[PDB]
From Swiss-Prot, chain A:
Name recorded for this polypeptide: 2-oxoglutarate dehydrogenase E1/E2 component
Domain of life: Bacteria
Family to which the UniProt record says this protein belongs: In the N-terminal section; belongs to the alpha-ketoglutarate dehydrogenase family. In the C-terminal section; belongs to the 2-oxoacid dehydrogenase family.
Function in brief: Catalyzes the E1 and E2 reactions as part of 2-oxoglutarate dehydrogenase (ODH) activity, to convert 2-oxoglutarate to succinyl-CoA and CO(2). OdhA has reductase activity with 2-oxoglutarate but does not react with pyruvate, and also displays transsuccinylase but no transacetylase activity. Since OdhA is not lipoylated, the succinyltransferase activity of its E2 domain is dependent on lipoyl residues of the acetyltransferase AceF.
Organism: Corynebacterium glutamicum (strain ATCC 13032 / DSM 20300 / JCM 1318 / BCRC 11384 / CCUG 27702 / LMG 3730 / NBRC 12168 / NCIMB 10025 / NRRL B-2784 / 534)
Note: Is non-lipoylated. In contrast, the E2 component AceF is the prominent lipoylated protein in C.glutamicum.
Length: 422, 247
């Protein structure tokens, strides 16, 4: 209780907020669907888990979309200053993106600082993710220099972490816009409804995005068009192809569409046709090639039978439940679980062709063994496989070294033949 | 890349935004049903098609409703000024309504100007529509005088054209309020649902309207009552009888 002078980083925050009173500002607000983000993010994180990678977040995706939008609408990167007593527009060389990092200090008081990712307009998603994680990592270890806090041209803030719906923030001198990301959650009139009922209707989740801009150099129409572009990108085919390409995921991304009525051919019939398609033709998209190579003059077969659009199903059916007739030893299942099992059995490192066989007992024997999966081997077994691989490669290298010119027809490239025959 | 002085109409826009920093402002937001607008607008446009007339828009209807609301709550038309070094309230003679016209120029850069429809408080819907279309028509042909840009008392803006949900705009010196009209569309939690399912439930479409006002001369209660009146008019029997009678 009482009065106490402001000292330190807090004094600097206070002075800058006072300076910011000389910027005329306006704000725009827009709400956007968020279902396709949830779906496609899950697909990327499944790939990283098998390759013992990390995990991407929603801020990463929205960050990258924001960069693409600023490239499409360059006026959002400009600023204002008075130089030699004349009004002036400032057009920077690069897009440097400022992240609001909330970091506790040694004392035990939280402070907010803005660090920059630099030269962002010449990056793909892989490069962007690396730069992001670099800044975050060095912040925790306390290894940020003074250069990292200089040259910001546009900023991003995330009040939706706590659960705020949207905000109207302050703009600091030297920039033209600041973007805010709100909560990704059901509206509050639906927060007591059942999952079953929401699934029937087709209700999705939101994200609300704001734009606060300096009105001396940016007009309202530009700000609106900026937010319209961001909305389009997060539901766009070409945008998710870039991200999937860069993270090396072998599947087609989930697409955006309206929910369709259960009329004509029933939806249970359509799920059974999808099961039959994977059992018959799933080998056409399996991960069986060690190289990332497609031979230029060979025809590529049609494999449109393996996407859920051709069977009149949609993202809105993934959490609904269906009759599957004993598939997986169950009478009932969700479309999410069906797709998961089919992909694990027919699209990983083993591809199988067996549906052309005429006898029913043969087909059933193979089908049962391929859908159970490969059993986990013991440690002794694993070491035995390593001994055989070593023998193969070592023998080849010995002959190479001692007899150079002599013809031997090597097995290098195909050393797994020795453990297969064994 | 680099620095360049601001010249022309852009310099004027910059100077006015700097002057506007000396107005204390607050904002109110309200959402309104929009189903009856869609229905009744369709009925009016069917009549015009058979009589080889034109077509009315949503801005025309909301514009007329806004005028009726200002008549019901006259305080929304007042402004503030310091004259002979004393604070003063200014009560105008007429309601002059400013339209935000986005017009491209010869160079190829968009600029925003505000033109006025004058003496609006003595007009019916037929007269209002004519005056509106007059200003728009002359703007495209490049035949607006200097008198058309003077004497605005209250303004209207439409960020919902692009699809923005709502905005918080700036107020310029000499006025007391500015009204903003947002997107007329389903909320984003329903943008992937089927038509069949929405029809069963009974889900309608929205419109969000804002009010930004000078707090030295207008209080919050007045601003709220203004928006409540606009909400009532757009769903009112007597309001749609006037429009149908006139067309």
């Amino acid at each position: 209780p009482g009065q106490t002078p402001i000292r330190g980083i807090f004094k600097s925050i206070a002075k800058n907020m006072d300076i910011s009173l000389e910027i005329p500002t306006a704000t725009s607000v827009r709400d956007m669907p968020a279902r396709l983000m949830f779906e496609n993010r899950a697909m990327v994180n499944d790939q990283l888990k098998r390759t013992r990678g990390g995990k991407i977040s929603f801020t990463h995706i929205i960050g990258y979309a924001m960069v693409k939008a600023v490239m499409a609408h360059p006026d959002m990167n400009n600023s204002y200053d008075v130089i030699d007593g004349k009004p002036t527009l400032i057009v920077p060389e690069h897009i440097n993106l400022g992240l609001a990092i909330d970091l506790p200090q040694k004392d035990g008081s939280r402070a907010l600082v803005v660090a920059a990712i630099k030269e962002t307009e010449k990056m793909n998603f892989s490069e962007f993710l690396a730069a992001y994680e670099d800044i975050v990592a060095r912040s925790r270890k306390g290894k940020l220099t003074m250069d990292d806090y200089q040259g910001v041209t546009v900023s991003l803030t995330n009040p939706g972490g706590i659960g705020t719906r949207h905000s109207v923030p302050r703009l600091t001198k030297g920039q033209g816009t600041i973007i805010g990301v709100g909560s990704m959650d059901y509206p509050a009139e639906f927060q007591g409804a059942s999952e079953d009922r929401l699934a029937e209707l087709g209700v999705g989740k939101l994200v609300t995005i704001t734009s606060t801009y300096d009105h001396r150099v940016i007009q309202g129409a530009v700000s609106g068009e900026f937010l319209r572009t961001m909305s389009r990108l997060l539901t766009d085919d070409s945008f998710w192809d870039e991200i999937f390409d860069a993270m090396n995921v072998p599947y087609t991304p989930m697409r955006w569409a309206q929910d369709v009525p259960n009329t004509g051919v029933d939806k249970n019939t359509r799920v059974m046709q999808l099961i039959e398609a994977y059992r018959s033709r799933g080998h056409l998209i399996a991960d069986t090639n060690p190289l990332s190579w497609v031979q230029p003059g060979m025809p590529v077969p049609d494999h449109r039978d393996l996407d859920i659009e051709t069977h009149n199903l949609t993202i809105w059916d993934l959490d609904r439940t269906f009759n599957v007739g004993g598939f997986g030893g169950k009478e009932t299942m969700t479309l999410r679980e069906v797709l998961s099992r089919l992909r694990a059995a027919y699209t990983l490192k083993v591809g199988s062709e067996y549906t052309h066989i005429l006898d029913r007992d043969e087909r059933t024997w193979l089908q049962d063994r391929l859908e159970a999966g490969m059993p986990k081997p013991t440690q002794a077994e694993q070491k035995y496989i390593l001994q055989k691989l070593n023998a193969a490669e070592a023998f080849e290298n010995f002959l190479q070294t001692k007899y150079v010119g002599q013809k031997r027809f090597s097995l290098e490239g195909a050393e797994a033949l020795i453990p297969l025959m064994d």
